[PDB]
Structure formats: C-alpha cells, structure tokens
Design a protein around this ligand. Sequence first.
Ligand SMILES: [Mg+2]
Ligand SMILES: [Mg+2]
Ligand SMILES: [Mg+2]
Lengths: 222, 231, 244, 212, 204, 233, 195, 240, 235
Amino acid sequence: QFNPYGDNGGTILGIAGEDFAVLAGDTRNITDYSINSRYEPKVFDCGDNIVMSANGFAADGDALVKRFKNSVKWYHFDHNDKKLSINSAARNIQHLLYGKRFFPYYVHTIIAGLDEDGKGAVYSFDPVGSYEREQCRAGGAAASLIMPFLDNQVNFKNQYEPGTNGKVKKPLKYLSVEEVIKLVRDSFTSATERHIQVGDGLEILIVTKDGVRKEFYELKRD
Amino acid sequence: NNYDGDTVTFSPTGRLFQVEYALEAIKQGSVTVGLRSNTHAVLVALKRNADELSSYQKKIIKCDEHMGLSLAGLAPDARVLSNYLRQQCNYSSLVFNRKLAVERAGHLLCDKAQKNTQSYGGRPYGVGLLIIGYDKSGAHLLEFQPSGNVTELYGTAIGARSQGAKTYLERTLDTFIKIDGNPDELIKAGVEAISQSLRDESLTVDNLSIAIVGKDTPFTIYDGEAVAKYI
Amino acid sequence: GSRRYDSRTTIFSPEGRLYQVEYALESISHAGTAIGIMASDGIVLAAERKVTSTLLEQDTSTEKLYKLNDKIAVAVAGLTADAEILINTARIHAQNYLKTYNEDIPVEILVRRLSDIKQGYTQHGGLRPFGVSFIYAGYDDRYGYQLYTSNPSGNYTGWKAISVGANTSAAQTLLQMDYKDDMKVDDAIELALKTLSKTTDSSALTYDRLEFATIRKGANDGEVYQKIFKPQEIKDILVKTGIT
Amino acid sequence: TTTLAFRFQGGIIVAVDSRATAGNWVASQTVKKVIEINPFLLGTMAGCAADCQFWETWLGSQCRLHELREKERISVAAASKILSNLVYQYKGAGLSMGTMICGYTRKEGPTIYYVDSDGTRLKGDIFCVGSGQTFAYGVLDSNYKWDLSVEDALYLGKRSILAAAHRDAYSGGSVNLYHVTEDGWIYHGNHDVGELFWKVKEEEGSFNNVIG
Amino acid sequence: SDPSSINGGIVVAMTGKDCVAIACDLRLGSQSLGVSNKFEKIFHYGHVFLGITGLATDVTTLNEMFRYKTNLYKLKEERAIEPETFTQLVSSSLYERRFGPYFVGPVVAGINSKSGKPFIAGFDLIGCIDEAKDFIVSGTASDQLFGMCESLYEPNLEPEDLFETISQALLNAADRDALSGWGAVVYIIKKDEVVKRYLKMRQD
Amino acid sequence: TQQPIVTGTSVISMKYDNGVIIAADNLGSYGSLLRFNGVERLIPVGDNTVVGISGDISDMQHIERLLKDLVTENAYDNPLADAEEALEPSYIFEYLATVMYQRRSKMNPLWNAIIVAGVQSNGDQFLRYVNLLGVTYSSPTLATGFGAHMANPLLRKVVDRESDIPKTTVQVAEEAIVNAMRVLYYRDARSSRNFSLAIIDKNTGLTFKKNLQVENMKWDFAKDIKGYGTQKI
Amino acid sequence: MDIILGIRVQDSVILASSKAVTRGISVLKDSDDKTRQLSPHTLMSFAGEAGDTVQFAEYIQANIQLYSIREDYELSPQAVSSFVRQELAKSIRSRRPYQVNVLIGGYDKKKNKPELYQIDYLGTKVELPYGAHGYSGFYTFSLLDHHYRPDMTTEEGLDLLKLCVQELEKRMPMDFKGVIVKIVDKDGIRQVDDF
Amino acid sequence: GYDRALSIFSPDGHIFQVEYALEAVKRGTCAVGVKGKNCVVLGCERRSTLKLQDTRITPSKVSKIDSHVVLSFSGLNADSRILIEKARVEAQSHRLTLEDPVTVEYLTRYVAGVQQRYTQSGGVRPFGVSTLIAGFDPRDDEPKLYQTEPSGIYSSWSAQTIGRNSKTVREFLEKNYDRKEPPATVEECVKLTVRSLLEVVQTGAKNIEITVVKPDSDIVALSSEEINQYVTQIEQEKQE
Amino acid sequence: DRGVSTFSPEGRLFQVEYSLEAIKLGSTAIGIATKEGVVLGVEKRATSPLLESDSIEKIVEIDRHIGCAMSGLTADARSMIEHARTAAVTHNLYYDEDINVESLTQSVCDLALRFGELMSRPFGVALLIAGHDADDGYQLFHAEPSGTFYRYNAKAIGSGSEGAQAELLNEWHSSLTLKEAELLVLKILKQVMEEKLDENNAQLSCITKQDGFKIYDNEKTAELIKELKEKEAAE
Ligand SMILES: [Mg+2]
Ligand SMILES: [Mg+2]
Ligand SMILES: [Mg+2]
C-alpha cells in the first residue's frame, strides 16, 4: 500500500528576544538510517521580515513554505504593498494548514519575526493549524531533548535564589542576541550528541528591525 | 451599422465594429508613454482626475518583480488582464522556477483577448496596455490592443493625443535607445516624450506616474513627490 | 446570435399584462365549452366536443374529461396535448402524496401544484405557456365537494358553478340565473345540459358531441364514485332532461 | 485537559487548565483553552485544538455578520447552534471537539451550551470537559450554589481546575479564569498551578497527603 | 445482522381448482423480541394479491410503491392489472435495485379476470421469477414450508379443501420457526369472491 | 495507488570542478527476473541536462514523453529556444518535482526516484533529487536505491563537502563513479554489468557514453573458499 | 439516548422518556427532554445516536409546522407517522443514516381517538397500544401485557407506567435519572411535573 | 438554460419590466394596511365581477406566513403564491437555526430581497406583486406594517394601501390617520380600515375582507356579518 | 434587440451609461473627509407622510471602521452591502486585522461589470464608501456601476450632485474639523433638497478612529440643524 508520508528528520528552534527573534535549524536531511544531504536549508526568509520553517515531512514542508511565500506576494498585490505583520501571517498559515485538515501537511511549523511594536515574536503550529505565540519553541526530532533545557536556562524554571531555599525565584532577566545564540548552539550541540538524526550543520536566521541575518555553524557529522 | 450589434458579426468589408468601438475607448483614455534602452525600460503615464476634489486614477500596475504595465481605456478590464498576467507570471515561477518572458506574456494576452472577439455573448476588452519588462533577453516594451494585436517596440504611446509623443520618440529613437546605465536620463526622455501630448494642462506632482524596470532594478512605481525631481 | 429569434415569452406589456398568457386565453376561448356545477350531493362535469365526425370512434374517445384519481377529475378547454402533459404530472403528484402520507391528496393541494407549474412557464424558462384551462371536480373529507378552475397564468379560483372555453360570458350568465345553493345533482345535470344547449355554436346538442361525468356520494354508503358517462348513457340523459 | 463553565447569580465563570500533551510528552504548558469569540462570547477548547480554534474563530465571524445584518446582539442559543449545525455537517469526517459556548444576553441571561463534534448541543448550568473533568466535577458539585459571589465563584472554578491538575496527568501548567457578564467577559488572570498548589495547600489546609 | 431475518415472517401461496390461496403469519419482531402480532404481509391491488416477507421497512415501502404503480397503471390502461403483468412489474422493480436491493421475498397470487386461470409466482430479492404450478413459499421458515407443502399438496383441490391444506402448511411450519407465528391469515380467492380467515394458533 | 512492475535500480551522480556526472545500468527487472537488458534510464534534455530515473519503467517512459513534449512546447513561439530561452536543468527539475508531488497528492504516484543532472547558463553545476513522494534534496553526491547505501559512501570520500568540488577533476570523478558501479554490480542482486554514463561539462558540453561495462572484477579469491565453516575440501 | 416508553389508553397517549444524557464516563445532564411537539395534538419522543436524534426531531418538527401553516390544518397522527417513516426509510439507504428511533403519540381530532406509533431507525412502523425502543420493552412488556386494558383512564395509565419505571430502576444496570412524562389528548399536550 | 436579460436599463435610466410589473399591481384589487396602538388590520377588496364563487375554498387574499405574521398583496395572484411559499419556508428555517421566529422586518427584508433578485437575474421577469406584511415581533407589543414592491425596495408604514384606486384611499388615510394618536382599539382600527375601502369598493357586501392581527400570535379574520355591521354604522353616521 | 454588454460608437457600455441616468434620479448623498473623520449624509425622500422615515436605510455599516451611503435604485445596494460585509469579515478571519478601505472598495467594484448573457444588468446605484485605516487614514471613495472608484476629499451623488459638488468645491479645505464638516453636509443637503430639511427627512453619520462608524440620532442631528440655522443668520 502506498504511504504518502515520510520522515526527513531535522530539528528546529525558535526563540523570541526583547527586540529580536531567531529561528534555527540543523541542515541534515535523512530517510531511515541514511543521510540525503548534509546541507539542505530548512529555515527560509519569506519576506516582510518573516522567517519560517516547516519541519517533518520535507515535501509537505517545502509545499507549505512555497504557498506562504506566494501568499505574501499576493497580499502585496491585493493590499497596496502593505507589510504582512507576523500576527497576520500566523492566522494566514492556520488557514493554509486547516485547508488540508483531512489530508494534513505532516509538519511542525514555526515562524519568527517582530510584532507591530518591534518586540520579538515566535509562532508555533501543529500539523492541522492550531497555533500560539510563544517565547521559546523547539520542533522536530530532538524537541524533547531541547525544550526542558530551555525551560531551565531561558525561563529559569526550578531555579531559585541562593539562601532563600525555594522562597524566591530566580528573576527573569532579558537575554541578548549573543546570549540566545549561545543557548541555541549548546542546544544543538547536545542534541547532536544524543540524537542520530541531528548533525552536520546549524543555520540560524536572526531577525531585527534592520532585517534578516544568517549565521552558520558546523555540527558533528557522525 | 447593421453589423455592429455584436462581436460575432463581420461587416461586408470584413470589419469587426465592436472591436473597433472597443479600440475607440482607448483613444478617449489618458495618454501613457513607454520607452526602453538596452538596460532599462520605462513607463510614463498622465493620470486623470474626475475633478479637483478627486484623486488621480492610477495607470500603472505591477505584474511581477520583473514585469508590469500601464493602461489606457476601461480600468476594470486592465485589472482583469493584469490579474491574468500576474497569475501567468506566477505559474511560470512556481512550476518552472522561471521568470515569464515578456514576449510570451504578450502572446498570452493576445490569445485571451481573441476569445472575446469570436464568441457570442461576450464583448471585447475596452483597454490598451503598455507592458515593460526585463528578462533573460534584456529590456522589452510591448503594446497591447484589445483586438488581440500585441507588438514589441522600442517606444510608443497610447491614449488621447498620443500621436505627439509617438512622433517625438520616432525622432529621438537613436538617442534614447543608447541611454544605458542611466535610469534618470531615460525617464527624462519619457517625461519629455509625454509632454508632446499635453494641452492646457502640465505635469504636476500628483498628475505624473512613472515606472521603471531594468538590469538590477525591480519593477517599481513612482508617484507623488518621488516624481517632483522630473517635473 | 440566437437572441435575434427569441420571442421573449415571459415579459410584461407596458400595461402590466403577460402577452403570452393573454394570447393563450384567446386560444382557449375557441375551445369547446366545458361546464362544472357543484351540488350538495355531488358535482357535474359537462363538456362539448369540437365539431366532430360520424366516423369518429366516440366510445373510445376522450378529449375533455380526465380522471386524476378516484376522487378528482378534470374538464379540459384548450390544447388537448398540452393538457395531457399536465394531467400526467397531476396524477403523479396525487400518487406521491398518497405514498408519503398514506392519505388521498386534498383537492386544493393538487390544484395549487398544477397551477404553480403553469405559473413557472410565465416567469422563467423562455418557453410558451400551456394553452389549457382546467375545471377541477373533486372530493375530500375536509371541504367535501369542490370545483376549481385554473388558466395559463397559473391563477386558480373556487366555484359553485363555472364554465371555460367558448361562450363563457353567455354560459356564466345562464348559470348565475338558475343556480341555487340547495340544488341537487339531478338538477345540476339538467342545468349543465340546458346551458350547453343554449350556448353551443352547433345547430343542436346531441349525444355524440358531448362528454359527461358526475362525482357522487351516490356510492354505496360513506364513499365517492366517479362516473364517466358512456355514449348511450349521454343519449339517455338527453332524452330524460327533454333536450332530444 | 480540564475545562469548566458554570452559571451563577453574577453570570458565568469559565476556568481552564493550560497543558497540551502528545502522548506522555508535555508539548506546552501555556496553551490558551478559552477562545475569545468576541467581547461577549467565550468558548472552551477540548479535543482537537485546531478544530476548536478554527471553528470558534469562524463562529465569531458569523456572529459579527449576524449583528451587522440584524442590528442586534446574537443570542447564545443562535451562536451555539451555528457551531453545532456546522460540525454536524462534518459528522463522521473526524472532527474532535468538546466545547462550552458561554454568553450573557438580555433575553436569555447567563447561558451555557455544551457543543460537541458528534452533533450534541446541550443547555445547562454546569459543564466540565476533558481528561480531568471528573475531578473538577467533584469540587464543583459539592460547593456550587446559585447565590455564590463573583469572588467565591472565581475561586471555586480555580480550585476545581487545581483538583484536576493535581490528579490528572494530562492537566496542569496554569489556570486561566474568566467572568462573563452581560456587558462582556472579564479576564481574571493566569495562575501557575505550581505556585497555586502550595498557596492553596497552606491557606486551605487541603492536600494533607502531599508533603510541603 | 442478516436483513432478511431481523423481523421474521412467512408467506405461502397455493393453486386449486378455479381458485388460489395465499397466507401469511402476523409476527413482526426485533430479532428475539416480538413487537407486533398484527403485521399482515399480504396486500392487494385490485384482484391481484401480493405477499411480502423479509425486512419490514422494505415490505411497507414496496407495498406503497406497487400501490403507486398499479394506481397509475389503472388510470392509463383503464383496467385493473393482471397477475401475469404485475409479476413482471415486481421483477422489473426489484432488479432496478440490483446493487442496493430490497431485502424481501415477494409472492404473487391471483386469477386472470379474462381467462379465469389461477396464477401464483415467487421472487428472490433481485427479481428472479419462480412461476410454479403448485405452490410458492417465502420467509424465515421457507424450508419448513417446502416440507409441509411438498407432502400435503395435491392438485385441483376445491376452495374449502385448499383452505385446510394451506392453513396446515403455514401453521405447522411457523411452529418450527422462532421468528414466525403470533397469528395467521388465509385468503381464499375465486374469480369473483375472496374470503379472508384469521386462524387460531399458539402465541409463543 | 499501484505497485511497480518492471523496475530499474540505482542511479548515481556527483559534482566535479567543471560539471556533473550521472550513471545508471541498463536493466529492467521483473521482480527477481532480469527481464529486459537494453533499457536506457538516462534521458538527455537538450545539451545541458540529463535526467536519471529509477523505479517503475512504465512511469519512466511516461516521464520521458513529458520531457520530450516539454522541449517541443518550449520551442513554440520562441526565437531564442536554442539560446537564452532554452530549457535549463533547474526548469526541468522544478517541472518534474511539481508533477511528482501533485501525483502523490492524488494518491496516484509516479513510482520513481529521479536525479536531474546538468549545467546552468552561468556555468553553475546542477544536481537535485526528487522521488515518488515529491521529496527533494541536493548534495555534492546523489544516488537512488542501493546506490544511496553503497555508492554515496564512496563518492563522498572524493567530495565530502562543497569546498571539495573545485578540487575534483573530471577524471577523478568519472573514476569514482565507475568504481561505484562495479561495487553495485558485486552487491545489488537487481543490477547488471552494462550501464550508461553521462558527463555534462560547462566547457565540453554533454558527453553521453553508452554500452559501458563493469571491468577489473575480483573473483579469483573465491577458489579458496570452501564450505561454510568446517569443510576442508 | 436510553429509555422511551409509550402507552395509549382510552382517551390519551402517554409518553415517558428518560432524563439522563451520558457522554461515556460522566452523566452530563439529568433533566434532558427527549421530545418535540410536531403539532398541537402530536408529540414525538426519540432515542438513538447523539446529535442525530435532536437534528432529526427538529427537522421533522419544522416540516410539520410548515405543512400546518401552508394548509391552515393539522395533519392526522397517522399522516404524520407515515411522513416520519418515509424520512427514516429514505435515511437508512443514505450515505450516513439517521440512527434515531421514535415514538409518535397523537390524538386524532377527527376520529376522537388516541394513537401511538412506534418507528425505528430503519423505518419500521407499527401502531400499538403500548410500545418502547431499545431494551425498555424487555423489562416492561410483561407488565403491560398483564395489566393493560383498552378502556384504561389516564390515571390508571400513569400508575401502570410507574410500575414499569420501577421495574426498570430495579433491573437495569444504567441510571437513567428518572423520566419526563407527557400526556397527549383532545386538549393538546401537557407535562406531568411530578413523577 | 434560458439566460436572457429581460430586466434592463433604458436610455432614460428606467427598467421597464420592473415598471410594467408595477402596472400589474395597479390592476390588482385594492389592499390596505392600518396599524393601531396594539394591533394591525389588513383590509382587502374583492371584485364582485365573480359571483357563483365558492368562498370557502377560493384562495383568501391574506395569508399567514407564520403564526405571528401575515401577508396580503395586490397584483398577479399566481406570482404571490411563489413569494408566500418562499416566505413560509424561510420563516421555518429561521426558527430552526436561530431558535426564534422571524421579526416582521426580517421577513419583509427577505421577501423584498427575492423580488429584487428577480429584477437582475437572467431569464426571469419581476414579480407583478406588491405586498403588505404585518404582525408583531416575538415577545413584542409594538405593531409592525411594511410594504414591498416589484423593484425590491421596502419600508415601514403607519398606514398604507396598494392596488387599484390606491391613490384615492391613500388620500383618505393621509387626512384621517393621526400619528400622535393612532386607532387606540381594534374597533377604531377596523372602522378606519373599512372606511378607507368604502371610498373605492362599491357595495360593502362580500367585497370587503378584514383580518385583525394582535400580539402573541392572535390572528383572526372577520366574517361577512361582522364587517357588515361596520359598513352599516359608517353610513348611518354619514347621513348627517 | 442588442447585447447587454454592447459598446457604443463612442466606446462606452450602453447599460453602464444608462444605469448612471438612474443614479441621477436618486436621492442626494454627500460625503466629506477630514483629518478628524469622514462625514456621510443622505436625503431620505419619503414618498408619503404615512411612511415611517426611520425605516429608510440609505446609510449602512460595512464594518466598525467602514461606513457606506447610497443613491439610486437602493434595492440593488443590498447584495453589494452583503458582499462588502462578507469581504470585511472574511479578511479579518484570514488575516486577524482590519481590511483597508481601498481594498474593500475594490472588492465591491469587482462585482460591477459581472453582467451579461452572472447578473442580467449593472447595478443601478452608486455608493459613497467612507472609512479609516492605519496606513492611509480617513478616506472617502465613490463606487460606480462602471467598476471605477475615485477617492475624494468630498463628494456628492444623486439628483442634486452637480450643484452640491460645486458647493463642495468652494467650501472644502484641508483643515476642516469634524463639526465643520457636519454643518457643511447639512448646509448643502438643505440647498439641493426639494422639501425643507429636518431631522426626519435627512440623516447624518460619521466614521472616526476612536468610536468607529456611527449613525447619528435624530435628536443629535436636530441640534446640528439648529446650530446651522443660527450661524447662517449670524451674517
Ligand atoms: Mg553516523
Ligand atoms: Mg413459531
Ligand atoms: Mg416465544
């Protein structure tokens, strides 16, 4: 019997800063125990200061990104080159996903950018279109390895102030882009050690008011 | 006369009057100019207002990053045809990862307009279009008539009093074709061309509409104070 | 194209009349006269066949009176072929209702249905209307004995006595003169035949030029019987009423 | 998941947990399970999150069109039925929804309709839906009165979700409270269950089984 | 689960000398549960009789369908339908649902009004006609009826003798079927008189 | 939904400094039966592209006809059909990838794994993969089926990353490809000795080699192997 | 839904229907009215699959109300029951059938007779002196077979109905949370608010 | 399908098919609507050119759309049935989905919408019908009276008349109807309605129909004798 | 006869030009755009005193940030309004935002030329669409049955339009307050109306960023009429 779905592995991570946002993802593409590509970009600049990644089944992921990029193009045509806000893009993607509610895009989608107040924004989707604005979200193969670490090191969960013994929480101080990138790199380095589908390379897209910037880092190739 | 009741009827001399009447709507429309060099292609359009309280009707429509047109005649028909061009440009990019050639875009517009001239119930399009673009064979300028006739040109003009601008471009042919790597001078030539079609009125800041596409220039439209530089 | 040849059958005149309906009514005015008379103990349907021949097989012939079901019958004035199209549709409607509710269709519901079909041809479709006027004679347990008429417009009305076809003006005046509310079927039979005898364009009214029917509760006890008269039976009732 | 809604003297209380799971894996602790259909109407999320989000947002659009056309606030009865009739069209296709459509109008008063993906539409005073519904019902049933104050009713809804969040493995994270009045709903904050549990334990004396 | 044995019931028809007989039980059930003891399975359209066994909703539906069709037949033909003609109508109507059939076992019985010849016929759920000279059986106790009819039946029985034969065939067949019984009716049909008799039987 | 009947095995390919190489054997298997021995599975499109196809052969022949029709269609009303507006490898790939994904979305796939190898107008190497699911990816080396498991490891030893491409000559690349085809012949039960090889170079254009054979095979060591453990004779 | 009972006495029809609505694990409601008034002298109770029950009942109600307005006339209970049967008989061969069983209790004003019709989701119609759907009949019919008389008063019918409900409450495993009882007679439909 | 544009603009900006539909309304028997303080009365003319009519079964001029709303009309009788059927179906559809009966304005808006649709749809002619729609909104005691016409425009009226000689009876209503003090009782409202028809009708015998609609679905049609008593009292006051 | 989609020898669509004549017979509607808001006003023009004038609905809400006034065959406007409302709500559903006033207007105007032998004829009504969005601020558009829409600082449509437009030519400036615009609409409506202007035969409305679209009460308008009378008597 024909199975229309597949699993191309991969792991992605989106973090929203105070005035920036990052969307990172490994560059490895796989089927079963084989490597298809050590560098196959998974995070895309979709225009209007929006970055996107649809992780899971790569054919559905490419189709969804392609359709959304197209939606941005037609938004400009239809609405006098108006900039598509991150919240408007999120609602639009819900409809793209839910349109195939009974034959879903087998992907976990994350987008990142800035909201209309210039603050960092990340949105997370399930395969059928349910979405939420989030501060921190890992997706894909090693999401279960990364998110607990992020709860601890970004939101300071289970961390209290020394001497108080659990009475006073560690205060949630804002992180810089350099600080966030360290956590992203350490997240993927750790994931690469313990997850076989994670490795080869790490590509990070950083979004600020100045635009979209890229950073690339090598990961272990075993 | 007896043969102008619909588009499905030839006259005894082999004319299609409904198509000719559709052509007449273009002549009533406001003047717009098109011209190109080897690096850039320019559209200049005189926008028309209803009165002093009203806005000036937009004349130029973007079809893709590398293509767009200006209109003269029925504006809703231009919207239908430009929408079709947007879709065809888009189909080419999505399916073939290929920017639609300007010449092929002209062929598609011809065929779409033709179907409305041979069938009962329909009507011809009542608008003329000047399509500019930059593709793999350089800069291009097309003139579309709702008869279906599409023509590739160095320069042209359509609308009321377009004959003055067309004669000017016919004189200046050898000069403006050589304006390579200088967008401002090519626009100047277009603004000077469209000036040969003005009577009583002159080019003001909300009157003038300019578009340009070229080698390292996406199709962009200039309106308002962005064209004061050229007035 | 095709527009050139379109008569536009469903348009108003400047006076707000439907051309085709009016012209169809003009056609019906030349059809043989049909009369319906409602009495307390039944209904009479009488109708004149149009200028016949001696070689016409009368006993197997039917052009005026039709059975829709066991309780409802119609008299036709106009194009017979048009009438049979509508009659068959009415017969099906009656059976659809009987299947759905397990009860015989009330007379008015059948009449309204046919009248709505006629109406449709005057408002949409661009087709000519049916050149038919019906007299409906029927019985149900709600209103008892009922007479209706419908015409090409799809308008229908209820009557105690009514005529359609030729010389309706003269016929209606004669009916209006001699009709009374406490009248019985046997009296109504006589009135119908007398009215036709006076309004006819023929020299004399004979059995071979008539179709006749009665709907009576003269069916043994609590039920209704339809009687489509035979040629000999029409001849007898003509002698009985003293017309021949 | 644990969601509840109950009618009382001061309107409606809506209380939900915040946890979303995929098997044993806790996908989120910050899920919004109350859908703000419009300023006057609320809907709860249970079943498929997308089905609830999508169709209750769509419902808001239908309610907006209604009041534009009819120049009058839509009734909770009519709003709930638009949703139930819609999901009934899809019956058999695989939608999964368990929601409470909550509102407060002039003609109806405070009204709650349980709407469900197999076509069910029930009007009622107290509803509880989700994997932790039984735990919440226990606290609700034993403490509910029509003449509760807004303050006590808000606490009751908060305490009932806490009861579920403690015992039900698939409920937790935080508690979201809403109070629905005739002039619209009022949000009463997000309450971390971790902090709330200890606070309630101390102040109330409950959960003596748990060491703190 | 099997649609033809949810409700239960039986019909049997026989020929005699210048007569025919058709009989049925009165039971309707929901498997083990007895629901009605007045569910007659024999209908008539003029002088043509139709018995129908099987799924009760289809029995009712088909009766309404053949009433519909025979009523229109009469209006157009200006005469009542005959047994032979009606048999073809039943077969046609059943086969038109070949891939979504009515779960029934019809039986036709009657005397041709012109020839005076007795006529019976049976069908399967999709229209195959069984035109037997002797007898036709249908229902959840059809095996039992075949056994009774095959031994009790003899040709050219007079009306009052045929009544006893068909009554005893039905009764004893029904008493060996859990889903049949709860009363019985027998029609004795002659060219211009029809008698209908309700039988006394055990109510278990 | 179907099942493949007549099938073709591995297609292998890699990039080198001035272009790309692609290869595939000439067998059409019918299950375990090596039915058809003269099947060309490398199909050139113009002078800049070669499409290598594995999987169902009936679907391959259909795709072959689509590509043939694509060339015809591109030439229509196109004065620059043999110049600036000629078909690019990227155009051909995107078209196929669109078709493959559309077909899988109708639950009626073209049961294939395809590699499009070519050189673009600007001289850039093109090498990308697409299969029956519409899944696409690019890499310095690409291979389908068994080739993915056995050829890629060998080819990746020559070009392990992007920076190795300019250092790799056509002689070294072809040598690596030919060795890989020998290894597949040793180890793939649905392979044949006969194969085709195509080179698309930005300078020398398209070189299409037919009727190649696997040679320099090692078998002599088999004579010493006796029994399955204890046998001495 | 669960238990729906019906009994036709001398001058009225009495319908009893359970109040419980259970969604798997929990009893969500204990005051549910499983009935719709189709016309002033015709009542229909229903039980079956969730959603389909109310959808079907309200659809029938709308149709009968439409007929009543169009003709300015109330259809007989027999006519209504035939309409309902056809809808269910149509439904059983649909893409997704209505899984709904109904009892139709009506007072015929023409004949001055109460009438009770039992129709299951297949479109199986029977007129009965008393009826039920599901397992309700298994517990109650032996009592009804014993005590029922055609000349019973409404009060005697209610007493026999109480005995039936008591037997159900004793031997049925499910808690159906009591029954709502409604009476249909010449004066229309009314609910017995203490049962 | 037949797609011909029958309703089109003329050089002077008129749609003649819609205007000719109004001429059909002008020919129709007179209908009048008057709303009191706590009721609405619909009066209708019956032309006495047709006697030997069976009044039991003949289609009545006032039709119930629901238990709380009624519709009367002037123009083509057959056309009106199609509008009445649609309105009745929509009334039940509204109850089914909104769980509340239609408001009089909603029902009017629907019927008017159907009429408009038939003025710019291909292959159809406009309805030769104007309607008066009257009743009370659910749980409301404010009287409602609306009018529609072939073009599809509709509006609310304190009192209105349509059909033949409606110019005359509107003249009467405009001078006799006071807005500050509408007919305070059923009697006064019926009297004013019968008076308005007597300006046009001929004999006050079987030529006048009267239907009274009160709040909470209280609708009743007056009989010949009841109306005859109004006719008698009006002329006896007039002899002065 | 002749096609519904036929061109005249001058290059104009007969049916579109004829529908424009129907609009000239319509009651007057006026719009004035300011930096504080856009005002919309209409002549009700009741055909009889027994007609309850508050049931005349010629000013209509499309969304909270967009209003609309009509002139001509007003029955034709209902499907246009329905479409506009649906388009406004649908865009909010798809994009979680307000739709641009121009985009809404363009969507309405797309219906206009969808006639032939689709609907059988053009619309016989013109619309003044007024609204606010964050990108282009307060806007007023004139939507015609030709499918063309012009943006206006001020515009009058209907029977008294050319006299009103000449008046708007003289009176409008870029510094008008909302109050000044309200009085100006009332002044010009009073000038072109047959009957004497009051709160029952004329209606005002406005759209502001803060409060959105609002139809004015008859009591509120009556005060503005009294304020108008006094300031005209002031010189
Ligand atoms: Mg490894
Ligand atoms: Mg037995
Ligand atoms: Mg037993």
